[PDB]
Amino acid sequence: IPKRLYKALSLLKKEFELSKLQQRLGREVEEKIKQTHRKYLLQEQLKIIKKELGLEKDDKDAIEEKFRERLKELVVPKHVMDVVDEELSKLGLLDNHSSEF
């Protein structure tokens, strides 16, 4: 009885020791991969923002993009630029079909 009890305990100890040393190596690998910059995670979300829909048509983003590449060409001032930027924020607030839109 004491031999079987200790050997069973030993088997639990050694198997747990293998799992523990391997799990620690894996936690260290997890630390070394977590070293990957937060920009990569937020960039994944940034790709998720542009990959939820298939096309660019039938949206306010389309018009925002043509007028915004425009904005990039014609050299707007800081005032009118920011004013159209905040107004564009409202246009984002505004509905795709509203008559005021």
Binding footprint of another protein on the chain (CB under 8 A): 18-19, 22-23, 26, 29-30, 32-34, 36, 41, 44-46, 48-49, 52-53
Of 14 and 66, which has the nearer Cβ to another protein?
A: 14
Give min distance, CB of 33 to another protein, in A. 5
> How is residue 25 annotated by DSSP?
H
How far is the C-alpha of 93 from the C-alpha of 18, rounded, in Å? Answer: 57
- Identity of the residue numbered 60: K
Q: At what angle do helices 78-93 and 60-73 cross, to 10 degrees?
A: 170
Give min distance, CB of 14 to another protein, in A. 11
